[PDB]
Amino acid sequence: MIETRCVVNRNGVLETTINHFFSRSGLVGVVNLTDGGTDTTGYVTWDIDIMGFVQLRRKCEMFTYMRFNAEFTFVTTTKNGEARPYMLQYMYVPPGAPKPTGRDAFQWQTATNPSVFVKLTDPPAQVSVPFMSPASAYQWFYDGYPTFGCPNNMMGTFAVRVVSREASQLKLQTRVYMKLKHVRAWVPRPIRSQPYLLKNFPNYDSSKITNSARDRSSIKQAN
Amino acid sequence: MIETRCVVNRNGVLETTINHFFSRSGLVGVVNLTDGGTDTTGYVTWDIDIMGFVQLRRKCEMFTYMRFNAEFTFVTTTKNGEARPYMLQYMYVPPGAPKPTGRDAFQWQTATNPSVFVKLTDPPAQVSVPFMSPASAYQWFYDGYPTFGCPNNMMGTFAVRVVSREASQLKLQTRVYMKLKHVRAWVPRPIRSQPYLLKNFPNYDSSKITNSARDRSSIKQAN
Amino acid sequence: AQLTVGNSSITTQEAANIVLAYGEWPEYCPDTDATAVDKPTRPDVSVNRFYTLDSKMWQENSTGWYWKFPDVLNKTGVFGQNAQFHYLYRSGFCLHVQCNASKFHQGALLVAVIPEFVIAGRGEAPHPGFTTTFPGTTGATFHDPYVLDSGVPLSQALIYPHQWINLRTNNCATVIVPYINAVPFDSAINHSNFGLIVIPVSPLKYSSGATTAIPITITIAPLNSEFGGLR
Amino acid sequence: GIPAELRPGTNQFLTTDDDTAAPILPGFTPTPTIHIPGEVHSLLELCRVETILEVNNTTEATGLTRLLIPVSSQNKADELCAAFMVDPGRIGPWQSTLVGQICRYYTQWSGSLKVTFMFTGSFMATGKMLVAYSPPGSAQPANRETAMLGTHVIWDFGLQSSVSLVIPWISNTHNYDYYTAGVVTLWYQTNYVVPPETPGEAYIIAMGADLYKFTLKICKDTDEVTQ
Amino acid sequence: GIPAELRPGTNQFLTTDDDTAAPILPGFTPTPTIHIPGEVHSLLELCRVETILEVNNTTEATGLTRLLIPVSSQNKADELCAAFMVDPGRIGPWQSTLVGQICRYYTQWSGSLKVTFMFTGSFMATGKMLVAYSPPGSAQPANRETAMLGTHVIWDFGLQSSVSLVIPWISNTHNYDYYTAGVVTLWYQTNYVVPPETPGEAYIIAMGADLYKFTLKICKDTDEVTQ
Amino acid sequence: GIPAELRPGTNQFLTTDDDTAAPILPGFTPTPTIHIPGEVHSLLELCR
């Protein structure tokens, strides 16, 4: 970097608020759609999960409880990336609803699953999902037995396909971007100092435990 | 699913209203347009009918009388689905008007049939159709002899063609989406427990009758 | 001072110094839809009183202990009876932790309350059994205190309602914990709301001839309990 | 003109979006409205109408006989007659009601219910029954004594011909089965008593409904319709 | 219609842009909010909670023993015990605090800090320590005399069991290392004094926190998480 | 929605045009200003 001096003044206080700290839309997943006729499925489903990537996972595990609305954006391109006018369908499947079993399956025509049709040459589609939980908040720490299927606090699922009668040979990936909005948070936690072993559970390697601070020669010498 | 708990609070009352229960635009039909010169017709007509699919058919047969405005949306793609700039024409034919007899036939130029011209690379076209009946409501239960042609309560018909001098070899399907608006409903009915044999009539198989509840071992044991 | 609640009386000093968890007192629930139909039970006669566990023996080699609530009280007295059945449950607590030690003993204990405290697997996916989630009245001992067995630094445990017990200054600590949940009522049997933790940060030290083990006594007083329809 | 910037969401069709569509036939005035009786403003109006539970669902009953709860004079006092879950949204004998059918259009419900028993005997027949409700989380009662130790009604159908039992609260959140049920049972307090020359067999009819406290959320489509 | 002109920025997706997205599920009312205690409106609330510095970081300490500052009766008066930088955002023994972890999410910080020393001995042990702060731009003090010629505290842990030292101002602007540090040291004013039959060894615990004057800017992502 | 008509000048970038650009880093407050002596409001100050 550069610009080495002393800052005698207070900084702006607005950047440290919880609602600004969880803002800034970012990439929550990558899924891949090959429409190959019968040798390939021809659609994708993506369950809505915040913890899939550990960067934002670490920032939600700072708190016990959170409440928010989500805003999604789908950036979709084809292999090399050159785009052609193909219609697509992003269907949202509410919690407690059956997901598509196949490309032409009847679930795609269910009206209670809200959909959006947009051509692949158009600007990326945006969608706003409300607060979906039956409790007053989402909690990724629940001491007890939740069981019942996959991540905790099921928000829903998106499914994507191409809209055509005959399968168009086309290879797609849809990047999903999520921006949390109107975020409230309760009961803060300590930040995890250990590597994550697996999703949905806070497992850690017992044999190898990393220490929170790095090491120095002696305790009586700072530098 | 997931999230297993007890809900101690009243839910939102807004989702159970009649007007919200019949909202949510959905697929009312699929028709297919091949412009083949003289070996193929080269246009399509779709009569406006709600009962064509049994999902929404079952929800209109909950009531005796209904009143509403319709909003239609045409999602049209070509075979594999890649789109090219071809103009199309969706003509609406009011109740009591002659329908197109062919692709170039004079009915397409009648002005009292309102039309919309849109290229196949454009976003899908939307149209709002008012309440069309000579009575104060539509009724799909009429005890008596209606006769007179096809479904009851004729709303109209849509016809689609391609706008060109020479037939362009092109194979189209137009998905029609309908959203009911300002819905009023009267005199509620019981919900049908039997399979539908045919459209326009509430026939049921007399030999095989399905029972409204499934079966258990004994009456003295719940689980 | 002597605190007398029901048929139980404990000896303890009178000090206005306590720790309110997060700064709020236990409260009865704001009126809900379900309990407007059936008015919930708010017992205090023999139900809300001091319960005192079997005391724990802190020795030079120890790791430290935790408890899960409501669980620790699920088989006790007339609270565990009401804890059984009654598919709806709500309550706060008053927790007093004591240590009997001579002036010649040295050491310190970190004492904290963790909401939704989840012990994890030390492995694969070894889902921890009902022993770590529901240790019962006795409680459990930590394996790796440094990570709390949650994968989390014990250094940062101080954003939880907490009090130190330093055998130099104070031998006791008291934490008032309200009901903390994302829903007004919950099941006391299948869900533990929070947990209590006593970890020696500075180990116990004494010179030969002193008692080699120091007892830690727990006392639990429920506050503003509510119970639901009877299973 | 006025400078503008197109934005994500341009040129997309969202099916739930509320927006304006161009009128295709302007200057057309529809038929004026008149007053038709029986207008319905909510599905909750249709939940609150008590309809017949089919408690007899069995491979041995065919016609209207599945709507009838048998009560005879051969049975002995203290023993059970009928038992059924309270689950309007599950598969069982709530599937014949309207609550049962409407719940299939929603993912979550909650509120209170009402269950009515109606005795059709001869005028001169007499006896008592025990109408009891075991809340969720417990198996159905084993005998009459443990049914009597909980919410219940003693109904003498010589005096009173019909009895209602309000169920205080029920909920289904939602393939682990999240609804832990709770059961209504029927016991013989007495034996059904009959004078000379009158049948000695009667039937109970069961009905069920939602109280005004009942609500529904998260729309979906029914599992009954296949297509 | 209304004449308009599209403009640079049309049809682009900026990830930080605050704009409206179409509701995909209108007419849906979420679950009403209730009062959950311990709501957090700022990360600055989490900086001000004093948490344990790990001053003993060494290859020779493993467990909780890295959180302990050793003090024994073998050491002689006037000589140093422990020394550590004041740098919540650098690699060292601020990395176990919350200030340490939150600073990793921001490029610039500044404000004042607080460092608390807590003595756990026997009740009857006694002595003095010198808690001193050398500001940035100077090496740590060489002896006690030059530590005493600057900001410091004489802390007798026979009388007082815990002592706090406010650091007046610290800043990190920001791979030349722009932060010139400044150091806290611990000296033996006296020798640790012990009566008969009591251990003669104790431990100091160190804690650190931000005063209300502390602030942060220019968001980023932590170097700890790898993925 | 609201009916509109695109017009000549659509989708063009004029370099002197005064228009709004989207903030790429909102919620960021720059360093507060202080008083620095010798501020210049015109080139005519430098001609004289």
Residue numbers in the entry:
A (entry chain A), B (entry chain A): 63 to 211, 224 to 297
C (entry chain B): 14 to 136, 143 to 250
D (entry chain C), E (entry chain C): 1 to 174, 183 to 235
F (entry chain C): 1 to 48
Sentences from the paper on this structure:
Coxsackievirus A10 (CVA10), belonging to the human type-A Enterovirus (HEV-A) subgroup, used to be associated mainly with herpangina, but in recent years has been increasingly reported to co-circulate with other members of the genus such as enterovirus 71 (EV71), CVA16 and CVA6 causing hand, foot, and mouth disease (HFMD) outbreaks in Asia, Europe, and North America2,3. Here, we provide models for CVA10 mature virus, empty- and A-particles at atomic resolution, and establish details of the events covering a staged exit of the VP1 N-terminus and ordered structural reorganizations of VP1 GH, VP2 A2B and VP3 GH loops and alterations of viral genome structure as well as genome–capsid interactions during the uncoating.
Compared to mature viruses, the CVA10 empty- and A-particles are markedly expanded with a ~5% increase in capsid radius. Interestingly, only parts of VP1 GH loop (residues 212–223) are flexible in A-particle. The most striking differences occur at the VP1 N-terminus (residues 1–71), which lies at the inner surface of the capsid in the mature virus, and is disordered in the empty particle, but traverses the capsid terminating on the external surface at residue 62 in the A-particle (the first 61 residues of VP1 might be disordered). It is quite likely that the rearrangements of the VP3 GH and VP2 A2B loops, together with increased volume via particle expansion, facilitate the egress of the VP1 N-terminus, obstructing the off-axis channels in A-particle, which might be triggered by receptor-attachment.
